[PDB]
């Protein structure tokens, strides 16, 4: 752009789309991934402006809609949604054309063979963009903390990923995929809240949901002992007055919802906790590779940002590990845009260009362009 | 006598009062759940008979009275109510005290955590009932279906909940409470009925619009089918007369309220339907679980006592029933009363017994063990 | 047993115990070697008849049940489900007490030091047991093949073990043991599933992953040149509707799971397969014996019974090994019961008690009788 080169750089998820052009820090056109239809149908002469309230715009106007939500863990839902999803960051906010520019992405890592391909016809295909590339998301973070090895856990919304990183690449022997992420911490809320008497069952107060979670709940830091303080209203108990009209009082679903993380037992599988399921990725690998990985931990996402987390961990993980050292969560002061930043390095340095995939080369190609240069 | 001591069983949600003994067929109380308080006053010399009335004088001599659903969406409203009915309805309907026989209440399956122990108070505190259930309604028709292996939909008046039970129960996952009932087609009917004649707004014809829900209303054969019919109003309108002096023909919203249970379409807000809460449960158990759960879906409770119900989940539950096994119903004829049935059935049994609350669990213990026998 | 004294031969594993009397052909009392627990909660009244769901009743119910896998790969996880495992086989099934006759059992090869002693203990220090012999497996199938020297590669579920063996025995200098086996093919497809959509994560989705891939994958004989054959259809995709519903297209995975014990860089280690790892027994031996371990290589158990296997090594094994020959793979019909087969004349053979342990001789001797009669 201008006198350089430049692009945009992108991190897609399940929640939310953060967009930017390239060399940011971390985003400038952010919203939430989902298109919203008229549910609440009368008829019409004054209309509150849209045939498809979309992110922001839907996310605001709740109660005529039925949110259809897409990428609901990396795999969506049906794509059709997605195409206006899209056609509001590049010319609504940025003002740019997707024609002109190459686009970073993100790999949501494991995302289906097919959806790599399906996603850059979408845009090489139906329209244009000039080069593209989709980050393999947990460990862009790493080289932004200033890391090489590490064991990283990054999830956001959509999927838990625990990723062993060294000074080379992790492979599909040792790295790990679970639901049970961000996402399912919202949702997971309303099969709780019934004990009290609330289930916000339906779609707009679905979105309402996600809302009061993120702004107050917590994570108990020994569930347990936290269990008879349960009796203690004041540290539990808050009013969350709805500015509508309903006061959810969250009292122990607060830290209860939050526990399911590292707690399984609650919803009703045998996943052992994001704890122990870093030991299940860390233990498969060579027998060497170990040492440096449990020297810093890096934890990041939507999901590592909740009050009282990384000191969790740093009792847990110590329990059946092994035993020998100096074990050190590093989660960074803002940890979320962990993916972002990381991403916003590559797109910047010139030296990327061993790498993507460049317009012209997806017709030499054909759709299996993607598979052909990367994975 | 025999196994048990032999309680007094009682399914009276927000429908129909349902009382008799352990050891009764058919119950003995059979009319409405409505709390009777007099509007229609005046003054008076002497006025007719009770302070309180339940459905024997409140469905009698409606129009003086106030006719008040007790319970709503499965929940107790306050305590004039519940309070009185569960001594009144043993002493003056039955004739013995709960103080002397033990008592089975249903619950409406997941209520708030203290709604366990506040039905509890009302025997234990209030009157001194020597034992008590206050049990899943879903699981007295499950044992009236005698089995293992059975994915048990069970809609009341108060509230449907889907609960698959295999060669073991289900975990907290696999379940499914549904705000979408009998109550939903009480207020569903005096809303549509002002399209074709009637707009009904109070408690009295509250109790007239039970009076045409349960005998008159239905689920239709299909609903497209018989929608694209409903310009024939001689084959599908027919009346039901108000039994003091009023004509109310009804014929295509025969169908458009208890349609509601299959099709959410005709609401407002998408409370989903017995079909997609079939799949909701069904498909969130394990993984090698549902052949058989295919082969014993048990259909209960008060609202699916209609026709177009045993028939019509042998019809729409095949579009999620994939290419091997197949959909096969289990509708008991008296499905209102299977819940009934199982009642007197399980409160017969010591081991039903044993795994309720007696007199002296509870004071020592500390109330919410009637929500740790149980749940 | 009657006018003789006979015994009960028996191949454990990893996968399955096969039990049968002595003198017998192949097995009678089989069943896989796995304990399962309730993980479905909820409560009960009716129940699905166990505590312990053990080996054929477990892998029956699945859906309940966490399945507590023991022998993985000759080490079992603990040893507490392993009692009741063989509280199947004897009592159950055979009839028979422990307590009363000789028991033939096998040597996983290479299993540790101390649980040699640790399983004499279980039959000799608690079941009494009047006589033991654990037989190590390879070498006995070697006899009932009518082979004297070969190279034998033996691998059922759990471990990989090339074997050179002559007209005397092999020593651990020259012999191998791999973890890359039959269970290990089974458990693997889940890592690669991933691509097309699947991940089978969790308990009784594991098991249908072993099921899956026993009944219809096949091994390529050539994988890269049969990837190109991966666009057709035909060969390839063929429908595993699950009896229980959701279909799974094993296309790809049919044979691209079964190379990885040819191709170890699939998962990613540096182990060549099993091709090389014969090489690598046969090579480090004396000079002179070697010409004959050529002319006859025998290749046997649950690992070398999949579609397109003899064939492959018989192209494969020539190109780095000595060139001068009559090379040739003796896969007998049924090959997997190498093992049972092989033990069961040493059973019948009174020649045998030239060998064993006997009761008194464990008291005699402490529980380090097994090293002081074996190693
Ligand atoms: N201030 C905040 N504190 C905690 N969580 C937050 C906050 N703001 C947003 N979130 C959460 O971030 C999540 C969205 O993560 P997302 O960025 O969409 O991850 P991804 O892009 O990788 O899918 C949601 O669960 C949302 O509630
Ligand atoms: N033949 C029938 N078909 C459909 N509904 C019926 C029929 N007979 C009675 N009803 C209705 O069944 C409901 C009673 O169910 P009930 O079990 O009392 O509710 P709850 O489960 O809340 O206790 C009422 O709405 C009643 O009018
Ligand atoms: N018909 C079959 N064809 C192919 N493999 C089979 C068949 N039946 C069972 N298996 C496989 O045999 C294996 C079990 O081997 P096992 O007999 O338990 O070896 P071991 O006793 O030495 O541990 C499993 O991988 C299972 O899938
Ligand atoms: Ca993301
Ligand atoms: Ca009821
Ligand atoms: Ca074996």
């Not at 990283?152 to 838990?160: A, M």
Request: aromatic residues 8%.
């Amino acid at each position: 752009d201008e006198d350089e080169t430049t692009a945009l750089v992108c991190d897609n998820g399940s929640g939310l789309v953060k967009a930017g052009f390239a060399g940011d820090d971390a985003p400038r056109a952010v919203f939430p991934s989902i298109v919203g239809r008229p549910r609440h149908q009368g008829v019409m002469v004054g209309m509150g402006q849209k045939d498809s309230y979309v992110g922001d715009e839907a996310q605001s106007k709740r109660g005529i809609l039925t949110l259809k939500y897409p990428i609901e863990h990396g795999i969506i839902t049906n794509w059709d949604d997605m195409e206006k999803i899209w056609h509001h960051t590049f010319y609504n906010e940025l003002r740019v054309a997707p024609e002109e520019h190459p686009t970073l992405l993100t790999e949501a890592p494991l995302n289906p063979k097919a959806n790599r391909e399906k996603m850059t016809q979408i845009m090489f295909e139906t329209f244009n963009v000039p080069a593209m590339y989709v980050a393999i998301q947990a460990v862009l973070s790493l080289y932004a903390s200033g890391r090489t090895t590490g064991i990283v856990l990054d999830s956001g919304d959509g999927v838990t990923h625990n990723v062993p990183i060294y000074e080379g690449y992790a492979l599909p022997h040792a790295i790990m995929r679970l639901d049970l992420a961000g996402r399912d911490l919202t949702d997971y809320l309303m099969k709780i809240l019934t004990e009290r008497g609330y289930s916000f069952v339906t779609t707009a107060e679905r979105e309402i949901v996600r809302d009061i979670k993120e702004k107050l709940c917590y994570v108990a830091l020994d569930f347990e002992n936290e269990m008879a303080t349960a009796a203690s209203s004041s540290s539990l108990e808050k009013s969350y007055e709805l500015p509508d009209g309903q006061v959810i009082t969250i009292g122990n679903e607060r830290f209860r919802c939050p526990e399911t993380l590292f707690q399984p037992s609650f919803i009703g599988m045998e996943s052992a906790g994001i704890h122990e399921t870093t030991y299940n990725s860390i233990m498969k690998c060579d027998i060497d590779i170990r040492k440096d990985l449990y020297a810093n931990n890096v934890m990041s996402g939507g999901t590592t940002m909740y009050p009282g987390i990384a000191d969790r961990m740093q009792k847990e993980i110590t329990a059946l590990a092994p035993s020998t050292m100096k074990i050190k969560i590093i989660a960074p002061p803002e940890r979320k845009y962990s993916v972002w930043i990381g991403g916003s390095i590559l797109a910047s340095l010139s030296t990327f260009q061993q790498m993507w995939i460049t317009k012209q080369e997806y017709d030499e190609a054909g759709p299996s362009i993607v598979h052909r240069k990367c994975f």
